[PDB]
Amino acid sequence: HHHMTIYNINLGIGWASSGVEYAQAYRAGVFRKLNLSSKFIFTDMILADNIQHLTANIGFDDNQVIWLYNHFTDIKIAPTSVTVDDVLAYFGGEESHREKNGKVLRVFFFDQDKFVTCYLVDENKDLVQHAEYVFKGNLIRKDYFSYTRYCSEYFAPKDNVAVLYQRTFYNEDGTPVYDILMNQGKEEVYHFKDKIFYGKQAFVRAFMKSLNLNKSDLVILDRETGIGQVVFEEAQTAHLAVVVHAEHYSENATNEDYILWNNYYDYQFTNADKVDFFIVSTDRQNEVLQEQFAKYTQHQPKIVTIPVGSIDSLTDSSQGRKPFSLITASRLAKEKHIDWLVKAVIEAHKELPELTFDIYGSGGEDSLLREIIANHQAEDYIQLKGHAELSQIYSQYEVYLTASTSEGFGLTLMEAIGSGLPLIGFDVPYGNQTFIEDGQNGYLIPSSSDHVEDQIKQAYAAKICQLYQENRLEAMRAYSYQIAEGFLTKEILEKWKKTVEEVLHD
Numbered sequence: 074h075h076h077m078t079i080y081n082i083n084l085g086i087g088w089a090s091s092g093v094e095y096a097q098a099y100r101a102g103v104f105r106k107l108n109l110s111s112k113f114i115f116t117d118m119i120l121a122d123n124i125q126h127l128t129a130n131i132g133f134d135d136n137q138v139i140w141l142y143n144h145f146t147d148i149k150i151a152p153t154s155v156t157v158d159d160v161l162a163y164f165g166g167e168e169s170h171r172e173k174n175g176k177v178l179r180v181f182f183f184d185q186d187k188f189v190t191c192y193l194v195d196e197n198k199d200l201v202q203h204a205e206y207v208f209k210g211n212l213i214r215k216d217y218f219s220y221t222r223y224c225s226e227y228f229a230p231k232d233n234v235a236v237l238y239q240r241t242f243y244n245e246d247g248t249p250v251y252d253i254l255m256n257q258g259k260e261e262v263y264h265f266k267d268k269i270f271y272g273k274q275a276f277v278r279a280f281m282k283s284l285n286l287n288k289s290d291l292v293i294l295d296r297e298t299g300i301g302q303v304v305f306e307e308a309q310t311a312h313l314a315v316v317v318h319a320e321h322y323s324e325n326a327t328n329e330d331y332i333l334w335n336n337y338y339d340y341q342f343t344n345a346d347k348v349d350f351f352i353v354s355t356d357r358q359n360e361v362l363q364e365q366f367a368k369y370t371q372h373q374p375k376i377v378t379i380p381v382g383s384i385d386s387l388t389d390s391s392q393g394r395k396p397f398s399l400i401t402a403s404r405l406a407k408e409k410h411i412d413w414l415v416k417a418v419i420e421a422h423k424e425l426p427e428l429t430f431d432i433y434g435s436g437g438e439d440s441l442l443r444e445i446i447a448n449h450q451a452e453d454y455i456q457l458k459g460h461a462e463l464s465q466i467y468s469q470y471e472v473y474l475t476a477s478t479s480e481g482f483g484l485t486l487m488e489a490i491g492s493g494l495p496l497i498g499f500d501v502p503y504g505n506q507t508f509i510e511d512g513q514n515g516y517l518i519p520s521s522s523d524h525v526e527d528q529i530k531q532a533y534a535a536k537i538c539q540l541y542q543e544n545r546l547e548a549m550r551a552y553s554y555q556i557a558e559g560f561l562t563k564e565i566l567e568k569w570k571k572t573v574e575e576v577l578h579d
């Protein structure tokens with residue numbers, strides 16, 4: 074490549090990803106619009122799914138995607154198109170019968186000692202994402218497929234448990250490119266046939282060098298656990314930007330003489346002299362971080378404010394908004410405190426029996442949330458919707474609720490106001506203070522460090538009730554759209570263009 078390329082580095086991606094991954098997807102949308110060459114690199118081993126299925130889901134174009142382990146081969150990022158028949162060709166013939174159970178297809182043979190389990194992309198299609206080969210009860214090999222087999226895993230029995238010892242990655246023609254020798258989940262040795270790498274760091278270094286980075290390239294680092302030093306070192310011949318996503322230090326641990334950074338930034342902040350610029354989503358975080366660099370460190374890095382999201386256009390309700398309908402959208406994670414919202418809604422429902430509350434997202438808090446709902450017999454008006462595509466969802470509702478105690482930005486807050494939702498949330502930095510004008514487009518609720526649950530639920534309940542009882546909904550929605558005009562894609566393109574124009578040239 075001769076053209077400027079923007080390389081973006083993250084660990085992983087899933088069906089129900091965090092805002093970090095969605096922010097990357099927003100950024101990809103911007104780079105496409107600016108007709109700029111970009112790559113989004115993921116460094117995690119992802120085998121449970123075809124990585125292309127995940128990236129396409131979130132909206133990356135296939136040619137914007139680099140997967141670390143695939144990169145050294147000539148197999149392109151692609152959807153799974155291998156069939157059951159294609160799969161069975163890798164294993165010996167003579168099928169006796171099958172068993173199907175959803176996506177799990179087990180193919181039995183007359184050789185009673187062997188069977189193949191296929192894991193289908195779609196229960197009602199014959200596309201096979203990966204397959205498992207079992208001999209006399211023992212798992213021996215797993216193959217992984219896109220348009221051909223790109224990876225095999227090799228297993229041997231120990232105490233009757235299958236132990237992974239080797240992973241091999243292939244080229245299109247079926248020849249192996251490299252083997253990873255495994256030890257209890259650690260990728261210890263990467264054997265490239267004519268050379269060898271010891272440890273993932275060395276492997277990632279080789280990857281970085283394989284990019285042939287030019288001075289006019291930009292490396293943007295989103296997440297970096299395990300690989301920071303190698304990325305930092307190899308990015309010096311290009312330009313290096315670090316995106317700060319969440320709150321970046323611990324207030325409770327910090328005092329006049331000592332600061333405790335967020336673990337995901339400690340490395341980057343310690344070595345800020347190696348970073349060309351940091352990116353933050355709000356000016357308040359910008360100023361906070363700048364001050365802390367001056368107060369606690371010997372660095373004075375460049376820090377630019379670029380929102381991680383933008384709104385293409387405001388979205389109007391297409392068929393109207395259900396009366397008294399409430400929405401929240403997040404990972405079901407402790408730091409979002411959706412349980413406080415559920416209890417608040419149960420309470421407000423005493424005064425407004427028409428209230429409903431839909432909860433979008435996935436996460437380990439689902440068990441607690443179901444328990445609270447069951448305990449109050451609230452199933453008919455409070456529901457978990459799962460992780461969904463939200464673009465058409467928000468404008469079907471009246472008001473958005475958040476009990477998150479901290480947001481670097483909060484993409485669902487931006488998305489919510491872009492669809493004309495008033496917001497009710499805690500008066501906490503940074504996102505809530507960016508997106509909520511108390512009394513104009515919703516309410517900011519004072520937060521306390523002791524976090525008394527009874528007080529919290531009473532406050533949210535009171536505020537929800539007040540919005541409806543004082544007839545504030547029309548005015549607040551209108552004000553949300555007004556705030557949202559400050560977060561439109563047109564503005565953001567210019568911010569990126571400007572930043573890109575400054576890394577290109579000087």
Ligand SMILES: O=c1ccn([C@@H]2O[C@H](COP(=O)(O)OP(=O)(O)O)[C@@H](O)[C@H]2O)c(=O)[nH]1
Binds near residue numbers: 093460462
């Ligand atoms: O059911 C859901 C819930 C969330 N999201 C997306 O996940 C991202 C969450 O980002 P945010 O900044 O709100 O929270 P984070 O997960 O970063 O704390 C947003 O872009 C949402 O649109 C989604 O697509 N479907």
Ligand SMILES: CC(=O)N[C@@H]1[C@@H](O)[C@H](O)[C@@H](CO)O[C@H]1O
Binds near residue numbers: 091092093318319482
């Ligand atoms: C809890 C928290 O701070 N989450 C931040 C979010 O506010 C921000 O929108 C996103 C994308 O930058 O990074 C997140 O993970």
